Amino acid sequence: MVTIKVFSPKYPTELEEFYAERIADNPLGFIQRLDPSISGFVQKLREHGGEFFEMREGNKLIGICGLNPINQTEAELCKFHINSAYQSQGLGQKLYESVEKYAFIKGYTKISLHVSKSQIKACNLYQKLGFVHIKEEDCVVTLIFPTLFMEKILS
Ligand SMILES: [K+]
Ligand SMILES: [K+]
């Protein structure tokens, strides 16, 4: 039974551990800009009016997804991460579709996101989910993070 809900920890550090496992899952050897802890992020997101979701297989946390309000009608998808062993079942898509229905019910008509240009598999999923390419920027930080900005209108 795959279940999607608002994230609720089984134990206080469950999210930290899940997130560290996702960051550790880097087989192509991409450079990583590490991120408060994810639990702090979630707390702040909820205080700002956002929401943070789990997907579980039985009791096992297998995915997460955040929604962060930009304004009255646009939300930003954030911290979207699936355990890569569940990528061929289309469970990333299942979690996103639940999150999207939630967004829609909440009065959002646009979801925006940004993603590293190196992350092919992620970009390909977002395309599959109906995100459209708006712009690329090499974000200077000197480290350059080539970044893809995408949106989806909801109906
Ligand atoms: K890289
Ligand atoms: K819903």
Numbering used by the authors: 0 to 34, 37 to 142, 148 to 161
List passages from the publication reporting this PDB structure.
To gain structural insights, the crystal structures of HP0935 in its apo and ACO-bound forms were determined to be 2.00 Å and 2.40 Å resolution, respectively (see Experimental procedures). In apo-HP0935, the α1-α2 loop adopts an extended, distal conformation, positioned away from the ACO-binding cleft. In the distal conformation, two to three residues at the C-terminus of the loop are disordered, probably, due to the lack of stabilizing contacts. In apo-HP0935, this region remains disordered, exposed to solvent channels, whereas in ACO-HP0935, it is ordered as a β-hairpin and forms part of a β-sheet alongside β1, β2, and β3 from a symmetry-related molecule. A conserved water molecule, hydrogen-bonded to L78, H115, and E77, was observed.
HP0935 is a small (161 amino acids long) single GNAT domain-containing protein belonging to type IV protein acetyltransferases. A biochemical study showed that HP0935, the only known protein acetyltransferase in H. pylori, can acetylate free lysine amino acid and lysine residues in proteins. The structure of HP0935 is composed of seven β-strands and four α-helices arranged in a topology—β1· α1· α2· β2· β3· β4· α3· β5· α4· β6· β7.
